[PDB]
């Protein structure tokens, strides 16, 4: 299958440099165009750069010209985005995507046929900030004692005071997904992020069924498993 | 540069309706226009390429058309799973700048659903650290508009809570919302009654959930 896998993101200080990689699999890399497209938090898509591995031709958005360099290693089926002199406004999820060859073809019967970005990577977050990495504290949101007899209870975990994004939360190592809501993080007045993850469960199940929230903050190598119990 | 002016910026429609999203290019882009669908936290997915070609595996309720520099994405029989942001994109310049429209957020209507409301005191472990977070949860409601007010010993709280809302659910088209009130340990311990009051079209009267710090 066609696969694009990005890596290299993370936190970097203003004026710093980072290099992203996009490892491609399952298609003819020489016979492709590779694009980087980014998305600032809550905003739209913005094309950043493109490369033809075969010709070596490159193109850049005006917003990054002179600071970013796109390149490819065909022996590695890999494309790279070198980012220099990074600014706060470069903070974004960066996606790799491809056109299969050709960019455009023409047959008298069908007309012009333009390619599109049919496969994308999962994206990698680049955060440009002077703030220091900090792992979260995890606190239980315990289910209320005023237990709805034959109805539904809610419980959760508060994940507080971390930087940068992201944290991931799962319940019972990923086995519990129904009724889970993990809220978007909010940036506090302190400059640190906080979020909550909640799950609704049968009130009947409290004190018999165990509920554990698994929190991972990879930027600080923090992993927490918090059992959430009544009281 | 070539701009793609996309409209509308948001729309809300009932299941089954026909939805139209348009993009006007600032100059000729031939038929070099694609349409993408992006679900929260996920990479965009291709729907339509070369203005009018349906990408393999995409339902036939999606279609694309062109009239000069005007391009239209039509979703013929809107479904709950069609909640997403949609983008147009032009690529007429070979190895040249690609540009995207600003996006259209599509909301799916559903029947009114009142929130289930829950309040959570701070844990003792958090209290040892010097801070107290009180959390109010509104679960699985529609429509989006909702008012959450915090009262501490009957005093409306201003400036010390933050709200977060989930993206619309792709199966049941509901929202959930959290409101978090942050107090210093000293302030939390001064007071007794903590209450969250929720107003929403699905509730005949506002709903209050409270606890006594004791």
């Amino acid at each position: 299958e066609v696969q694009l896998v990005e890596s290299g993101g993370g936190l970097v200080q203003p004026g710093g440099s980072l290099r992203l990689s996009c490892a491609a699999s399952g298609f003819n890399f020489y016979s492709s165009y590779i694009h980087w497209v980014r998305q600032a938090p809550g905003k739209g898509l913005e094309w950043v750069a493109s490369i033809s591995p075969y010709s070596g031709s490159t193109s850049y958005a005006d917003s990054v010209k002179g600071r970013f360099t796109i390149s490819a290693d065909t022996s590695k089926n890999t494309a790279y985005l070198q980012m220099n002199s990074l600014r706060a406004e470069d903070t974004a999820v960066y996606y790799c995507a491809r056109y299969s060859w050709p960019w455009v073809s023409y047959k008298p019967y069908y007309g012009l046929h333009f390619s599109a970005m049919d496969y994308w990577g999962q994206g990698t977050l680049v955060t440009v900030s002077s703030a220091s990495t900090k792992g979260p504290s995890v606190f239980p949101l315990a289910p209320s004692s005023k237990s709805t007899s034959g109805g539904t209870a809610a419980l959760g975990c508060l994940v507080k005071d971390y930087f940068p994004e992201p944290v991931t939360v799962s319940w019972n190592s990923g086995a519990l997904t129904s009724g889970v809501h993990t809220f978007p993080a909010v940036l506090q007045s302190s400059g640190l992020y906080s979020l909550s993850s909640v799950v609704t469960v049968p009130s009947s199940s409290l004190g018999t069924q165990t509920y554990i929230c698994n929190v991972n903050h990879k930027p600080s190598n923090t992993k927490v498993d918090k059992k959430v119990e009544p009281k | 540069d070539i701009q793609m002016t996309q409209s509308p910026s948001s729309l809300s429609a009932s299941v089954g309706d026909r939805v139209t999203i348009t993009c006007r290019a600032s100059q000729s882009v031939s038929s070099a226009v694609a349409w993408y669908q992006q679900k929260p936290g996920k990479a965009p997915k291709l729907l339509i390429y070369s203005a009018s070609s349906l990408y393999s595996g995409v339902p036939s309720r999606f279609s694309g058309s062109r009239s000069g520099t005007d391009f239209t994405l039509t979703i013929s029989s809107l479904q709950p799973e069609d909640f997403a942001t949609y983008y147009c994109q032009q690529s007429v310049s070979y190895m040249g700048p690609l540009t995207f429209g600003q996006g259209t957020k599509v909301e799916i209507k559903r029947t009114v659903a009142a929130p289930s409301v829950f309040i959570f005191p701070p844990s003792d472990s958090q209290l040892k650290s010097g801070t107290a977070s009180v959390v109010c949860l509104l679960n699985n409601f529609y429509p989006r508009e909702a008012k959450v007010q915090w009262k501490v010993d009957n005093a409306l709280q201003s400036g010390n809570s933050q709200e977060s809302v989930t993206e619309q659910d792709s199966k049941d088209s509901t929202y959930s919302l959290s409101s978090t009130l942050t107090l210093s340990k000293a302030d939390y311990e001064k007071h007794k009654v903590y209450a969250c009051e929720v107003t929403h079209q699905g509730l005949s009267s506002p709903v209050t959930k409270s606890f006594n710090r004791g």
């Binding site: 050709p102 960019w103 455009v104 073809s105 023409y106 012009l112 | 031939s30 310049s93």
Partner: peptide, 30 residues
């Protein structure tokens, strides 16, 4: 026929001239 190799050596004006030739000036007729 793939057009990429041709387009790679053309200015924007020349590229759009060729593309509009092939689509029969679609933007400028009823």
């Amino acid at each position: 026929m793939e057009l990429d190799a041709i387009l790679d050596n053309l200015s924007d004006e020349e590229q759009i001239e060729l593309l509009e030739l092939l689509e029969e000036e679609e933007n400028y007729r009823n």
